[PDB]
A paper describes a structure:
Synaptic pLGICs play a central role in fast neuronal signalling, translating neurotransmitter release into an electrical signal by opening an ion channel gate depolarising the transmembrane potential. Five protein subunits are arranged in homo- or heteropentameric pseudo-symmetry around a central ion-conducting pore. Ligand binding at the subunit interfaces at the extracellular domain (ECD) is relayed to the 6-nm-distant transmembrane domain (TMD) comprised of four α-helices per subunit (M1–M4). We report the structures of 5HT3R reconstituted into lipid bilayers in the presence and absence of its native agonist serotonin (5-HT).
Numbering used by the authors:
A (entry chain C): 8 to 333, 403 to 462
B (entry chain D): 8 to 333, 399 to 462
C (entry chain E), D (entry chain B), E (entry chain A): 8 to 333, 401 to 462
Write the structure that this text describes.
C-alpha cells in the first residue's frame, strides 16, 4: 500500500494549525513538565556578575490534535517530526544575558496520545549575585527561573518531569575536573505576579556550587604565611638599629613578587573584595614602615650631635605607650678620643624611641597574621560544612 | 463541529493582509502605548561612553481587522497568535549600538476588540554622555528614546501604558546587589522634527542611576588621606637644614606608588577626569617642589660651595613678602692641631641669613600643602551631600 | 465597500515581480538619491586603522510599477509597505569591515508616482588611514564610498537628496560630548572604473573630524614641561658633580615614570609616531649623555687625581669650538701637615678637567634647545588645528 | 526529450516528505557511517579548559525513497541535490561550547540506491579536562563524542566509514607548523544510557596531541638552571654576609625577576600547577631561609659586643647531625693602643658560630637535592613525552 | 504589450529547477572562472597564526537553461536577477577560520548565452604559518585555496578569468597606507586527491607581502644600538669600581625603560621569536653582571679584603685564562706609620683587584662581540627584504 510513517505524518500535519495552542477547551491550560540536568560549569566572571553553564534540558506537554490510533499505522506508537511544524511554548529564562550559542534541535518525538518530547542543550549566560568575601572558600547559589514570557497560568502552567529529589542528587553527568563542584540543584515553583490582572508560572532552579580551593591554598596562603611568619622574626630576634634592614629588603623582595603574581590571579570586583587581600597589604604595609623606620634611625644616630634632640614634645605621648605594651698637650689629645666616641647626646633620645616603637609594629603584625590564620579555618569549615 | 481557536484563527488570518497598517480610514493614526521596567544594570563602560541594560518591555496598539464576537467562538475573549503573522510597528531606539541578544518572542496576545499585546525583553547597548567628574559620587541620567524610524505622527503616535508616576517609582523588579542603584525612570513625550515636511513621535525615558561608592571610599580616599596627613608632619618635624630629604623622598614614593593602583581602578576615560586625581598630583607636585627647593638650600649651604650666596636685592624681594603675611715651639702645636681639629669638628659661615630664607619658604609651603589637602576634604563631602541628596 | 489600503496593496503587489529592476525601458538607468547625517563618532582605533560611526541614512528611487491614482483609493497619496516585497538596490560601502549591527527596517514609504523612500540607520566599521603625527591636535579625512557592487552606471547612477552645502553644515544631530568633534561632511561624485568595459558609480563622503585636545594637554604636556624645566635648574645652579648627579638621576626616574604612564593611554600604531614622543626620548637621551660625560670625568679625574694630563689634542678641538660656541718636631709638623696633605690637591689636570667641563654647559645649551622646539612645535599644531 | 537531472529531481522530490525518517519499516533503524579527518589545531586555552580545532567531516546514510533505475535517466548514477530538501540526522557533539563559525554546505551527493554522502567542515570549540602538570612536555587526549541529541539506538545507530586503523594513522592533511603535534585519533563506539527507558548511540574520537616544548625548553629551563647553579657556588666559598649576603640576594633579584617573567609566559589555570613552578618557589624559599639564618649569625658573632650565650641544648642536636650527615710614655701609645683596639675586634661566639655556620653546609645539601630533582623530573618528562 | 524584463524573468525562472547543476549532458563538468583582487591587509596576528584580509572576488560559469534570443525581448542582452533564484556552486576556502562578516549580494548578472557573473567581497580570516624570525624585515607567503567542498573535478573544474600575469601584479586597488606592503598574488592550479575514488579541483593564491620596518627601526634599533655602545665606554676606559658602577647604573634605566616599551610592541609567538630579542636580553644580562661584579669588588676591597687573601687556584685559573687569551720618637712615627699602612691595603687586595679587573677586558670582549653580530644580521635581513 504505502509506508505507515508517511501515511501518518500527512494525516497529522495536514489541517494542523501551527501557532494555535493545542487544546479543544480554551479554558483548560496546557502543562509543561520540566527536567534540568547539569553537565558543566564553564566560567564564573566574578566581576561582570554572570555565570556560564551548560545543562541538558528536556520538557514535554500535550497536544490534543497530535493523536492517532497506532493499530492503523502498522502498530507504530512513537514518531519523530520537525519542531518548526508544530506549536511550541515560549519557555525562557528570566536571568539571561546572551544566548545563541545554544543550537536548534530540528526534531521532537511524539506519542499516539499527544505527548510531545523536546530535548535540547542550553549554553546559558545568566546573571548572579556572586560573593567573594571568602574567595577560595567560596560558595554560591545562582538561580535559573524558567517561565513563559507571554502566556499566563490560565494558558501555561509549569511542573516537573521527575521528582525533586532526583533533581537535587543528579551527578550522572558532570565534569568534576573543573574549578567548581556541584552540590545541589534545588527547584521551586511560584505563581509570579507583578500586577493584578495577570499571574505567571515560574519554576526556579537554585544551582549551588563550591570552589576547589586547593590550587589557591598553595599558591597564595603558603607564600603569604611563609612571608608573614618570617617578617615576625625581623622584629624580635635582631635589634632595632641594625642590619635587620637586610632581613626586610629580602622579605619585601619576595613579598612584592607574591603580591604581583597573585594580583594577576584573584578577582577584583567593584562591589567587594576578599579578606585575604586585606591582610596582605597590611602585612606589606608594616614591613615597609618598620623598614622605613629602621633605615632612619641607623642614619640618624650615624652622626654625632648633627641634629640635637629637637622633637622632644612627643616623648610625653610615648609615656603610656610604654604602659600600653608592658704631655700636657697630649692630655687633651688623648681626651679627644673618649670625647669623640661618646654617643649619648642624640642617640639615647631616638634610640628609646625606636625600641618602644618597634614593639608596636611587631605586636600589631602578630595579630594581622593571627586573624589571617584564624579566619582562614572558618571559611574552610563553612566550605566544608556544605 | 470543530474547536473554537481553529475556527477563530482561520476566521481572522485568512484574507488578513500582513504588512498593511491595520486601519480603515488611512487619515487616522495608529497609537501605541508603552511601558518600561528596569530589571538590571549590567555594565557601564565609562571609556566607550555606553550603557548596558535589561528591560522588560511591553506595548499595545489596535488592529481594526482582528475583531470578533466572542459569543460565536465559545465565549472566548482572549487569544494568542504568532507575531510574524500580523502587522507590527517599527519601534526602535535611537540611542542604540548593538542588538541581537534580545531574543524574539514569537507569540502575542489579542483581544476581541483589536487590542494586541506584545511583551518582550530588551538587552540593550546604548550610547550615553557620561561624566566621572564626581567619580565615586557619580549620578548620571541616560536617555532611552523610543520612536518609529519611518512612520510619522500622522501614522504612528506614541503613548504610555501607565501613569508616569507609576513608571518612576517602579522597582517591582531590580537587582540592588549590583554596583549601581536606581532612582527614577522619568519619561517625556516629544514631537521630533528635523526638517519642515515630516514630524516624528518620541517618548524618552531618562534613566537616572547612582553609584555605590563604599568600596572606592576605602581603597582610594583613606590612602590618599593617609599619604596627605603624614606629608604634613614631615613639614614641622625637620626644619630646612636637616633631614627633610630623609622623609620627602620616602613619601614621594608613596604617592607615586599609590598613584598606580588608582590608574587601573579608576576608569581611564579621555573626555575628562575626576577631581581627586587632580588633588593627588597637585599634592605630588608640591612634594617635588618642597623637596627640590629643600635640596638647593640644605645640602648646598652644608656643602659650602658658595661663600657669598646671599642676594640682598632678592632676599629683600623675599622679605618684602614674608613681612606682608607675618717645648715652647711645640707648646703651640696642639693649639695649631686644635685649629685643625676645629677643621675636623664642624662648620659655619654667614649662610644663616641666606639659609633663613630657605627655612621660611618650607614653612610657607606648609601654608599651601595644608591648603590643598583642605579643599580635597571639603570637596569630598559636598559630593557626598549631592550624591546623598539624590 | 472595502478599505483602501487593503484594496491598494493587492493592486500593486499582485503581479509584481520582485527581483526585476523596475523600469519599462531597460536602456534607461535607475537613479538613487542619497543623504547622510552623522549622529555620533563611537570609536577611533588608531592601531587597527578603523573608524566606528553611527549615521542616519536615507535614499529614494522611482519604481515605474508602484503607481496609482489616489482618487480611486480614497484620495490617499502615500503608503507604507514592507521592503522584502519590492526591488531594492545593492548599495554598499566599500570601506567596510564588519556590518550586522545595523538592524533591518522592514517598512518603506511609497508615493503614488513611484518614489520609494527608505530610511534606515547604519552602524558602520570602516577602514581609514588615520595619522597621529600630531597626536593631541590631529585631523582626519575619512571616506565613506557609497556604490552598488554589481550594477553599472547604465543601470544605477547615484545623486544627492539635498544640496552639498546643506550636507556639510548638517549638525542638527551630533553628540558634541564625545572625544571627537565634527567639522564637515564633504560629498563627491565619481565614475569609478578599473577595467575597460564596466564603469561604476560612486558617491564619496569625506568625513572630517577633530580631536578635543584638552584632556591630553593636561595629562602629558604640562608634566613633560614640568619635568623638562627641572632638568634645567638641575644643571646650572648645581655645577657640582655630587648633588647634581643625584638629583639629576632623581629626575631621570620620574622622567621615565611619566614616560610610561602616558604610554598606556598614548595610541601607538606601527605606521608612525607622534612628535611629542620623539621629544621625550631625545630629551631623555641628552639627560643621559650629559650624565655620561659628567661621570666620564668626575670620578676619574676629580674624586681621584689619577695623573691624566695627557689629552691636550682633545682640548685643541675644544679650543676651536670656544670661538664657535659664540727629631720629634720634624714629625709633629709631618702629622700636623699630613692632615693638610689629606686636603684637596687641585693639580694641573683638574685645570685641564674644567675645559672638558665646559661642554657640560654646551649640552645644557642643546637640551635647552630641545625643550624650546618642544614649545614651538606645539603652538603650530595648536594653530593649524585652530585653522580647521 | 528533456534533460535527465531535471527529469530526475522531479521524480524524487515530488511527493517527498522531508522531516520523515526515510525508511519503510519503522522497526528498522537507519545507520550513519562516520569519518573524521583532522586538519589543524587552532587554539588551546588551558585556563578555560577548552580546545579549538578544525576537522573535515563526512558521513553517509541510506534513504529508501531516494532510489531510481539509472537506465531510464541516461545511465546517470550520481546526483547533487540541496541539503534542505531531504531528511538529515540530528548529529552533534556533546562536548561543544560555541558553534556557528562553521558554514553550511547547501549541497549533498546521492546515489541510485539511497546512499547520501554529506561532506562538511567543522570549526569546533570543545571542552576538555586539560592538565599542565607537565607543562612543556605535555600531552592531552580530548574527546569528540558524536551522537544524536533526540533519536535513540532504535532509530539511529552510528558507525564508521573507514577502519579505525585508517582513522588513527590519518595525517593526510595536518599543519605540523603549529604549536601542537598530532599523534592519534582513536575512535570508540558506545551505547549511552543515562536512564532505563532509552539508550543512545555514541562514537567518540580521542584526539591525542603533543606539545612542541623546544621554545619553552629554552626560555625557562636554561635560565632556571643558570640561576640555580649560581646560588650554589655562593654557598661554598664565602663564609659570611659581607662575602655571602651581597652575592646571593643579587641572584634573588634575578631569580625573583625570572619567576615573574615565566608567569606571563606560563598558562594560568586554577585546577593544578606544573612541577617546575614548584621547584622555582622552593629553591627561592630555601634561598631565603639560607639568607635568614646567615644574617642572625652575623649580628651576634661578627657584630655584637656581648651576644646571646650558647644554650648548647640545641648543639647537642646539631652534633647528632654530623653523626648522620658525615705619664708621657703610655699616653703616646695609649692612642696607638686606642687605634690598635679600634682596629682589633673579636668575641667568644666563634664556638657559637660553628654550630650555626655548618647549618649553611647542611641546607646547602638541600639546594643540591632540589636542583638535582629539578633535573631528574625534567628528563623523565622528556622521555615519557618522547615515548608518546 | 508588456515590458521585456517581466516578460523575460517569467520566461526563465518559471519551470527552472534550482538545486540542479545547470547542464543537459550530466557527463560534462561546469567550469567556474575565477578572479581575485586584493584591497587591503587588515590584520596579521602572529600569535594566533591567522591573517585578516579583504579582497574583491568575482566568478563566472555557464547555465544552459538561462538562455534567450534578445530580439524577442527588445534586444536586451544583459539582465540582473537574484542569486537565491539560481544554482550557485559551493566554492569555499579550505584554510578559513570564520566567515560571516562579509554581506550577501542579492543580485547577479546574466547574459543571453548563460554567462552568469557574481561579484562580491570577502572579509576572510585565514590560517597561515607566519614566521617572525626576521621580525621587522619579514616576508610571508600565505595561501588562499579555492575549491568546491563537495563536487568533484567531473562536475566542477576551476580556471581563471584573467591571465596569471595580470593577477600576479594588480595593485589597481590596494591601501599602501598600512603596515604591510603587497608584492605578488601568485595563482596555481592543482588537482586535490586525498583518496583513490575522488579527485577535487583547486586554485591556490599565494599572497606574498612585506612589512614596512621603518617605524620599528626607529623605535627599536637605534635606542638599542645607542644603549649598546655607551656601555662600551664603561667597559673600556674606566676599570674603576665606583665610577663604572655609577655609569652602568644610568644605562640600565634607559635600557630597562627601553626593554619594556619594546616588549608590548613586538609580537610574542610561542613557536619562536625574532633574533632581535636574543641580543637584547644578552645585552641586558651582560650589563648587570659587570655592574654586579664591580659592586662585589668595591664592597670587599674597602671593608675587609684580607679575609680571603686571594684564592690562588682561581688566581691560577684567571692567570692561565688571560695567558691563553693573549720610647717616643719612632713611637710617634709608629702612629704616623700606622697611617702609612692605611695608604693601601695588603697585596691580598691587589690580587682581589686583579680578580675583578682582568674580567672586564673579557666582558668587554664579549659584549662588543655580541654587538657585532647584532649589526651584521640587521643588514643581511635588510638585503633579503630589499631583494624581495
Ligand atoms: N542524547 C540524549 C542525551 C540525553 C539524555 N537525557 C537528556 C535530557 C535532556 C537533553 O537535552 C539531552 C539528554
Ligand atoms: N513573564 C511576564 C513577566 C512580565 C510582567 N510584566 C511585563 C512587562 C513586560 C515584559 O516584557 C514582561 C513582563
Ligand atoms: N525617525 C526618523 C528620523 C530621521 C529623520 N531623518 C532621517 C534620515 C535618515 C534616517 O535613517 C532617519 C531619519
Ligand atoms: N563595484 C564594482 C567594483 C568592481 C570592479 N571589479 C570587481 C571585481 C570583484 C568585485 O567583488 C567588485 C568589483
Ligand atoms: N573538497 C573535498 C575535500 C575532502 C576530502 N575528503 C573529505 C572529507 C570530509 C570533508 O568535509 C571534506 C573532504
Amino acid at each position: 500500500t504505502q509506508p505507515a510513517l508517511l501515511r501518518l505524518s500527512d494525516h497529522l500535519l495536514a489541517n494542523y494549525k501551527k501557532g494555535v495552542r493545542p487544546v479543544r477547551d480554551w479554558r483548560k491550560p496546557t502543562t509543561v513538565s520540566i527536567d534540568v540536568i547539569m553537565y558543566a560549569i564553564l566560567n564564573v566572571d566574578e566581576k561582570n556578575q554572570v555565570l556560564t553553564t551548560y545543562i541538558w534540558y528536556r520538557q514535554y506537554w500535550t497536544d490534543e490534535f497530535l493523536q492517532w490510533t497506532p493499530e492503523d499505522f502498522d502498530n507504530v506508537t512513537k514518531l519523530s517530526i520537525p519542531t518548526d511544524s508544530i506549536w511550541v511554548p515560549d519557555i525562557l529564562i528570566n536571568e539571561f544575558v546572551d544566548v545563541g550559542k545554544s543550537p536548534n534541535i530540528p526534531y521532537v518525538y511524539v506519542h499516539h496520545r499527544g505527548e510531545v518530547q523536546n530535548y535540547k542543550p542550553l549554553q546559558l549566560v545568566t546573571a548572579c549575585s556572586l560573593d567573594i568575601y571568602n574567595f577560595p572558600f567560596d560558595v554560591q547559589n545562582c538561580s535559573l527561573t524558567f517561565t513563559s514570557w507571554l502566556h499566563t497560568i490560565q494558558d501555561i502552567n509549569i511542573t516537573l518531569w521527575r521528582s525533586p529529589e532526583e533533581v537535587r542528587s543528579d551527578k550522572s553527568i558532570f565534569i568534576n575536573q573543573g574549578e567548581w563542584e556541584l552540590l545541589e540543584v534545588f527547584p521551586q515553583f511560584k505563581e509570579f505576579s507583578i500586577d493584578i490582572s495577570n499571574s505567571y508560572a515560574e519554576m526556579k532552579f537554585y544551582v549551588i556550587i563550591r570552589r576547589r580551593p586547593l590550587f589557591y591554598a598553595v599558591s597564595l596562603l603558603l607564600p603569604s604565611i611563609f612571608l608573614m611568619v618570617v617578617d615576625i622574626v625581623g622584629f624580635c630576634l635582631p635589634p632595632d638599629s641594625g642590619e635587620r634592614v637586610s632581613f626586610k629588603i629580602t622579605l619585601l623582595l619576595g613579598y612584592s613578587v607574591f603580591l604581583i603574581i597573585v594580583s594577576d590571579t584573584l578577582p577584583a570586583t567593584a562591589i567587594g573584595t576578599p579578606l585575604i587581600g586585606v591582610y596582605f597589604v597590611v602585612c606589606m604595609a608594616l614591613l615597609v614602615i618598620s623598614l622605613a623606620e629602621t633605615i632612619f634611625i641607623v642614619r640618624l644616630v650615624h652622626k654625632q650631635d648633627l641634629q640635637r634632640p629637637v622633637p622632644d614634645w612627643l616623648r610625653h605621648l610615648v609615656l603610656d605607650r610604654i604602659a600600653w605594651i608592658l704631655l700636657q698637650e697630649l692630655s687633651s689629645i688623648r681626651h679627644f678620643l673618649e670625647k669623640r666616641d661618646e654617643m649619648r647626646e642624640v642617640a639615647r633620645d631616638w634610640l628609646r624611641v625606636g625600641y618602644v616603637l618597634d614593639r608596636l609594629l611587631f605586636r600589631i603584625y602578630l595579630l594581622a597574621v593571627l586573624a589571617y590564620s584564624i579566619t582562614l579555618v572558618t571559611l574552610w569549615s563553612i566550605w566544608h560544612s556544605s
